[PDB]
């Protein structure tokens, strides 16, 4: 009895779309004025890439909380670096994710490496979604 | 940085992005998994973005073709199935392009617009992995 999930995006004029999520939150998308938009909200691709970053970020946070070392984590960010063709169909050719951490004291690197590998290789939180003509790459960076 | 974005964890299960376009995006989860339910889920943003990708194609092309002044309403509905066990994968994805036009809908042009977005630009299928081909349909309402 597989779950059927539904969402809807409504055009609200010009190039703007509004979604009310199942989680009951607003999402707006817009584009540049040059292509008919009002630059009043993020671009659709921006939401795609942001969502992908969120999928893996949530994994890592959850896992490190679980592994009881998140209390040492002062900062965490994800950076995505991509290449994508210009001619239609525009496809991702490279996707690289940086997981960048600031810990208080020596970082729990074995735990961090495990959380990231879990997200990337077991959960496949990015690769299970995003088509890319190379394997998604990632790295782990510690900042002081 | 060209073709580069970043998401910052700001506590609990919440992340903030400042887009290249200079807008805010927030993501969060349910309280049961450590979030504050104060923003959409990451996956909701993925699928929102995908619907917007094709939605803006459709709107741009209909405007180009000079029939958008006839269009009272336009929405995209996505229906999807995804497995539950890791690795979670999309198994079925169907998009409805749902239009309300004054008078007789410009059906040839709408089909062309949707076909271009789905089949030429591959605005969804270029991006989203699914175990079955992404399907779609056009619906007219009154």
């Amino acid at each position: 009895h597989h779950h059927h999930h539904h969402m809807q995006a409504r055009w609200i004029g010009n190039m703007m779309f509004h979604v009310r999520t199942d989680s009951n939150h607003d999402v707006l998308m817009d584009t540049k004025e040059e292509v008919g938009g009002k630059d009043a909200a993020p671009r659709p691709l921006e939401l795609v890439l942001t969502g992908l970053m969120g999928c893996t970020g949530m994994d890592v946070v959850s896992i490190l909380r679980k592994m009881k070392v998140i209390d040492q984590m002062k900062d965490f960010r994800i950076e995505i670096e991509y290449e994508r063709t210009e001619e239609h169909p525009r496809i991702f050719t490279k996707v690289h994710l940086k997981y960048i951490f600031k810990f208080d004291g020596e970082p729990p690197k074995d735990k961090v490496e495990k959380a990231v590998q879990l997200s990337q290789e077991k959960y496949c939180s990015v690769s299970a979604i995003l088509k890319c003509s190379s394997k998604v790459t990632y790295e782990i960076v510690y900042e002081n």
Side-chain angles (χ1 to χ4, degrees), chain A residues 1-70 72-73 75-85 88-121 123-144:
Chain A
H1 305 296
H2 314 258
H3 293 290
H4 292 202
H5 309 276
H6 181 276
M7 297 185 75
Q8 73 191 80
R10 161 180 75 106
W11 175 65
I12 64 162
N14 290 304
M15 289 287 268
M16 185 166 263
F17 283 82
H18 178 245
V19 166
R20 191 110 184 109
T21 64
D22 202 65
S23 57
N24 249 271
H25 295 295
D26 293 303
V27 189
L28 287 291
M29 290 169 292
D30 199 2
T31 195
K32 278 187 179 197
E33 291 199 51
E34 292 86 349
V35 301
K38 300 292 175 187
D39 190 21
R43 308 320 164 231
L45 195 69
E46 291 176 325
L47 296 194
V48 172
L49 292 169
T50 291
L52 288 170
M53 288 192 293
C55 293
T56 179
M58 306 292 185
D59 291 335
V60 166
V61 171
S62 184
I63 291 167
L64 296 171
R65 192 170 287 119
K66 183 157 172 287
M67 290 175 165
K68 310 188 291 184
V69 294
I70 196 151
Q72 304 153 219
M73 199 173 77
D75 286 306
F76 172 42
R77 76 170 181 280
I78 293 166
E79 295 188 2
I80 191 161
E81 292 164 7
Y82 61 92
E83 283 315 323
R84 178 171 185 251
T85 60
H88 290 308
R90 295 202 57 176
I91 60 171
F92 287 83
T93 61
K94 290 191 306 188
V95 178
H96 185 67
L97 290 146
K98 306 182 167 175
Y99 294 84
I100 304 156
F101 304 90
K102 176 173 297 80
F103 279 85
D104 182 26
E106 184 71 43
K109 296 183 179 197
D110 291 339
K111 292 189 158 161
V112 170
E113 288 167 24
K114 183 50 166 175
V116 175
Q117 316 324 129
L118 281 173
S119 189
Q120 278 289 334
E121 309 284 350
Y123 299 6
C124 297
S125 282
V126 175
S127 306
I129 299 185
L130 180 68
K131 293 187 183 173
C132 189
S133 68
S134 61
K135 187 180 198 187
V136 168
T137 60
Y138 54 99
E139 61 177 283
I140 296 167
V141 177
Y142 306 101
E143 291 184 336
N144 280 13

